[PDB]
Amino acid sequence: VAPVRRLLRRLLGPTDPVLASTVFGVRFPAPLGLAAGFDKDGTALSSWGAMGFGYAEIGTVTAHPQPLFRLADDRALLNRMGFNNHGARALAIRLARHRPEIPIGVNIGKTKKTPAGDAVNDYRASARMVGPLASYLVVNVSSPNTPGLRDLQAVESLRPILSAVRAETSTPVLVKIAPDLSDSDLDDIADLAVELDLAGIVATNTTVSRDGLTTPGVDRLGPGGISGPPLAQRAVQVLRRLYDRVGDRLALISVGGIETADDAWERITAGASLLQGYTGFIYGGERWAKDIHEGIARRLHDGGFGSLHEAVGSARR
Amino acid sequence: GSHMVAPVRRLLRRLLGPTDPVLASTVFGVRFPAPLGLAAGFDKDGTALSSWGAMGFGYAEIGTVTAHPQPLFRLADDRALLNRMGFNNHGARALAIRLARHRPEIPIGVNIGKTKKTPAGDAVNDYRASARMVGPLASYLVVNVSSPNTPGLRDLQAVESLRPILSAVRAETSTPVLVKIAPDLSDSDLDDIADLAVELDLAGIVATNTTVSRDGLTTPGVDRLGPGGISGPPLAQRAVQVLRRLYDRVGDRLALISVGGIETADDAWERITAGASLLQGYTGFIYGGERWAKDIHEGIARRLHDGGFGSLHEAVGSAR
Numbered sequence: 001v002a003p004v005r006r007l008l009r010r011l012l013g014p015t016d017p018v019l020a021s022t023v024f025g026v027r028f029p030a031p032l033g034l035a036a037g038f039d040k041d042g043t044a045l046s047s048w049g050a051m052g053f054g055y056a057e058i059g060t061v062t063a064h065p066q067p068l069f070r071l072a073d074d075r076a077l078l079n080r081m082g083f084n085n086h087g088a089r090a091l092a093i094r095l096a097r098h099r100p101e102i103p104i105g106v107n108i109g110k111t112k113k114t115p116a117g118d119a120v121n122d123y124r125a126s127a128r129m130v131g132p133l134a135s136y137l138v139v140n141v142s143s144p145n146t147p148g149l150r151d152l153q154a155v156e157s158l159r160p161i162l163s164a165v166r167a168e169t170s171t172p173v174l175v176k177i178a179p180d181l182s183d184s185d186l187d188d189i190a191d192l193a194v195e196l197d198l199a200g201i202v203a204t205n206t207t208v209s210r211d212g213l214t215t216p217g218v219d220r221l222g223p224g225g226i227s228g229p230p231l232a233q234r235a236v237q238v239l240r241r242l243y244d245r246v247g248d249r250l251a252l253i254s255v256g257g258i259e260t261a262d263d264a265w266e267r268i269t270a271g272a273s274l275l276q277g278y279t280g281f282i283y284g285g286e287r288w289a290k291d292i293h294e295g296i297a298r299r300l301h302d303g304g305f306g307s308l309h310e311a312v313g314s315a316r317r
Numbered sequence: 318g319s320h321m322v323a324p325v326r327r328l329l330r331r332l333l334g335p336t337d338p339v340l341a342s343t344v345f346g347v348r349f350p351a352p353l354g355l356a357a358g359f360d361k362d363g364t365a366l367s368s369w370g371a372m373g374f375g376y377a378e379i380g381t382v383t384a385h386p387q388p389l390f391r392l393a394d395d396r397a398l399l400n401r402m403g404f405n406n407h408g409a410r411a412l413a414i415r416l417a418r419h420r421p422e423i424p425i426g427v428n429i430g431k432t433k434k435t436p437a438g439d440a441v442n443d444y445r446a447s448a449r450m451v452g453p454l455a456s457y458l459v460v461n462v463s464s465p466n467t468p469g470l471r472d473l474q475a476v477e478s479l480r481p482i483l484s485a486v487r488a489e490t491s492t493p494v495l496v497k498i499a500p501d502l503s504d505s506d507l508d509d510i511a512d513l514a515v516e517l518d519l520a521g522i523v524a525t526n527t528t529v530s531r532d533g534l535t536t537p538g539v540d541r542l543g544p545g546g547i548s549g550p551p552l553a554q555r556a557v558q559v560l561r562r563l564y565d566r567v568g569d570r571l572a573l574i575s576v577g578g579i580e581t582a583d584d585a586w587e588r589i590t591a592g593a594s595l596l597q598g599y600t601g602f603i604y605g606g607e608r609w610a611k612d613i614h615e616g617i618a619r620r621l622h623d624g625g626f627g628s629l630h631e632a633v634g635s636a637r
């Protein structure tokens with residue numbers, strides 16, 4: 001009955017409790033969060049929960065301040081921006097002044113002007129400035145528009161970065177990886193993440209490949225990462241490899257081409273503890289998150305699952 | 318106390334070289350550890366032979382070099398170049414000394430062209446002399462009859478003039494001999510040149526040199542930057558359609574090497590799959606730097622695994 005229901009919804013929030021879980025020590029009310037690069041400076045922090053996201057990842061943000069084509073035939077996007085943002089310090093100040101009702105992850109990346117060999121201390125400083133307030137921290141070493149950044153995923157470079165971030169804060173630390181890594185790179189990053197006692201891995205960032213695109217005149221468009229369904233196959237493949245290798249030892253967050261509740265359920269069942277999307281929200285609207293979540297809740301209830309956690313990785317056991 | 322595998326992969330790369338073994342192939346009896354090479358014109362005199370593997374290349378083609386010694390605009394909107402220089406080089410004799418001093422590592426091809434002074438009714442004996450000198454030390458030799466800045470050179474592509482050059486050179490050495498062609502050739506000449514190469518049992522064809530065309534250019538004011546060959550992305554369309562034509566017609570009989578406008582891993586996979594056994598690049602290295610080649614190789618490896626190609630050779634020509 002509506003007057004009551006309106007009070008229940010207002011009081012408890014918009015997602016079914018069955019969706020709630022703890023991941024790396026953090027209570028997430030629902031598994032689909034907003035991926036990085038949308039709320040770059042944390043200017044809509046209080047809106048995300050009312051829009052039916054379980055959490056939001058803010059950034060990428062950099063140690064210093066540094067103040068997009070629709071591909072509709074592919075239901076995809078091509079991103080031409082680097083890390084435009086007001087810096088990690090500015091974000092910390094915003095976060096201190098609250099502190100939304102859902103978890104806020106912070107995504108940190110190397111300031112553009114920082115030389116590669118000074119990358120370690122640039123990540124360290126961002127982590128130090130925002131880590132206390134963030135629910136979790138993600139080291140972005142995978143965005144293609146920042147020159148040289150993907151090179152830091154080689155384990156010889158990555159280790160000192162991840163080690164410095166992880167020693168700086170007891171906030172959970174994750175790493176965000178590219179979709180195009182070799183199998184042996186994926187295995188090695190996975191093992192490094194376990195070895196450094198990180199909380200998890202976010203897979204995947206955008207791809208630079210334009211293979212498969214229908215949208216006409218895509219040739220003409222310049223450099224930039226590709227998002228959306230072009231990533232979906234790889235992102236699931238990468239998820240299943242990591243889950244099989246290291247899924248008992250850290251959490252996996254799956255991102256890349258999630259459009260429908262079916263997409264999302266396949267990721268959970270394949271070993272994703274949490275999800276994100278960016279592209280499908282742009283093509284899909286406010287509904288979008290809220291419809292995906294009702295879809296997951298239905299599949300948990302219909303399957304025998306007393307909780308989300310119980311479903312995670314359930315197709316691989 | 319790490320139980321990681323990465324330290325052992327580091328040793329593997331140290332012992333075996335940086336490239337994924339899947340990228341390795343044999344083409345005209347030479348083992349190329351990876352398919353993207355440095356195109357001619359950049360290391361003219363074999364001055365950085367030991368450095369090219371380290372840049373990520375699978376091989377390098379050095380020259381053009383001529384029998385006797387004879388010692389560019391950035392088109393930024395097209396990520397292209399306009400070259401106005403001819404064949405400045407220290408000559409085949411000097412290069413042979415460097416080749417003989419080089420401790421192996423990746424194959425080194427040598428690109429030979431006619432000495433500018435040399436008549437043309439005397440081109441044969443010039444090409445022969447160079448072949449004699451660098452032939453014995455090169456992994457392969459290419460006969461360049463396609464560079465635009467050398468007066469009268471592209472005329473040599475006429476089968477009637479090309480025949481005795483390729484034939485004298487092929488007869489001088491047992492080193493695989495290839496021919497490098499211009500993109501501006503008519504399709505009928507392309508078929509006859511391909512047929513000649515097969516007729517003379519050549520090892521392959523390198524396609525393409527630079528273009529004289531000015532069509533397709535985005536950079537303002539090219540129209541009075543003056544004469545010269547254009548390289549980079551503007552060649553890509555013609556380079557791919559020459560590659561497909563040649564592979565369709567003559568791809569069983571000799572190797573095709575694709576060059577012209579390869580920028581990305583996507584570009585490179587497309588060439589492979591259209592029938593290039595090997596690739597080269599110049600412009601893309603100028604723009605994309607020390608990384609560029611290494612990036613193309615890791616993308617080919619990923620697509621071979623994907624795949625699931627057991628070796629590079631299996632994918633060459635898979636699109637056709």
Ligand SMILES: Cc1cc2nc3c(=O)[nH]c(=O)nc-3n(C[C@H](O)[C@H](O)[C@H](O)COP(=O)(O)O)c2cc1C
Nearest residue numbers: 035036037060079204205227228256257277278279
């Ligand atoms: C326009 C745009 C900007 C992005 N900016 C960032 C960023 O700053 N940091 C980051 O880690 N990922 C960034 N991403 C990647 C997304 O966070 C996400 O990993 C990717 O788009 C795959 O998800 P999707 O297919 O649901 O879009 C961006 C993506 C898009 C489309």
Ligand SMILES: Cc1cc2nc3c(=O)[nH]c(=O)nc-3n(C[C@H](O)[C@H](O)[C@H](O)COP(=O)(O)O)c2cc1C
Nearest residue numbers: 356357358381400525526548549577578598599600
């Ligand atoms: C500055 C410059 C010098 C070159 N010199 C030679 C040469 O001496 N001999 C040759 O066969 N090709 C030469 N080339 C042609 C390249 O080997 C290549 O065929 C052409 O540039 C297309 O490839 P790219 O688009 O990757 O540069 C030269 C190209 C450039 C840009």
Ligand SMILES: [Cl-]
Nearest residue numbers: 082083112146
């Ligand atoms: Cl940037």
Ligand SMILES: [Cl-]
Nearest residue numbers: 079144206225
């Ligand atoms: Cl991107």
Ligand SMILES: [Cl-]
Nearest residue numbers: 403404433467
């Ligand atoms: Cl000349």
Ligand SMILES: [Cl-]
Nearest residue numbers: 414415417418
């Ligand atoms: Cl000596």
Ligand SMILES: [Cl-]
Nearest residue numbers: 400465527546
């Ligand atoms: Cl030229």
Ligand SMILES: [Mg+2]
Nearest residue numbers: 508509512513
């Ligand atoms: Mg014929």
